[PDB]
Design a protein around this ligand. Structure first.
Ligand SMILES: O=C(O)C[C@@H](NC(=O)c1ccc2[nH]ccc2n1)c1ccc(Br)cc1
Length: 164
């Protein structure tokens, strides 16, 4: 049901699209959220996915944190996808703006290997402060399952394809 993606490798595909709109259209088995360790979905991809769920993602996430405590940087948890997907895989890439180790980006993408197919954003990109060209390279060199990357910014999308 994914359509219009450009094939980068055997298993990695990419499209200039809003991941919220893509999830509403496709209703994938798994949508990846660019989460923080507290599952506080304020802004970026997380704020946008949460708003699309009418804040149900944040209510579920606060119950998960109250029970389990925070995730690790490089870690993940599987929660409901609400109206966007069957499941949401909340993955914590390092936030370089907040001082986290960029080597944890490969650990973050390893979480995707537990799922056969995913709709995802580039981890640690945008407000997380990392170089998106580097994030795409770690993605293609780490993930073995089928990943459909949605890149919101048109100019970044064009740069990512032309420099790949
Ligand atoms: O373009 C990408 O997908 C990376 C992107 N991410 C966001 O910050 C980002 C933020 C909010 C969003 N809502 C749905 C999606 C989404 N994404 C980013 C945007 C612009 C620049 Br300039 C650099 C990076």
């Amino acid at each position: 049901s994914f359509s219009g993606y450009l094939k980068l490798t055997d298993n990695v595909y990419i499209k200039n699209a809003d991941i919220v709109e893509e999830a509403k259209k496709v209703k994938p088995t798994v949508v990846v959220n660019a989460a923080n360790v507290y599952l506080k979905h304020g802004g970026g991809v997380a704020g946008a996915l949460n708003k699309a769920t009418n804040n149900a993602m944040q209510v579920e996430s606060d119950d998960y944190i109250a029970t389990n405590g925070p995730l690790k940087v490089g870690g993940s948890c599987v929660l409901s996808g609400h109206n966007l997907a069957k499941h949401c895989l909340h993955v914590v890439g390092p936030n370089v703006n907040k001082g986290e180790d960029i080597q944890l980006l490969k650990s973050a993408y390893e979480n995707f290997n537990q799922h056969e197919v995913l709709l995802a954003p580039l981890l640690s990109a945008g407000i997380f402060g990392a170089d998106p060209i580097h994030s795409l390279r770690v993605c293609v060199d780490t993930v073995r399952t089928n990943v459909y990357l949605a890149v919101f910014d048109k100019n970044l999308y064009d740069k990512l394809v032309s420099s790949f």
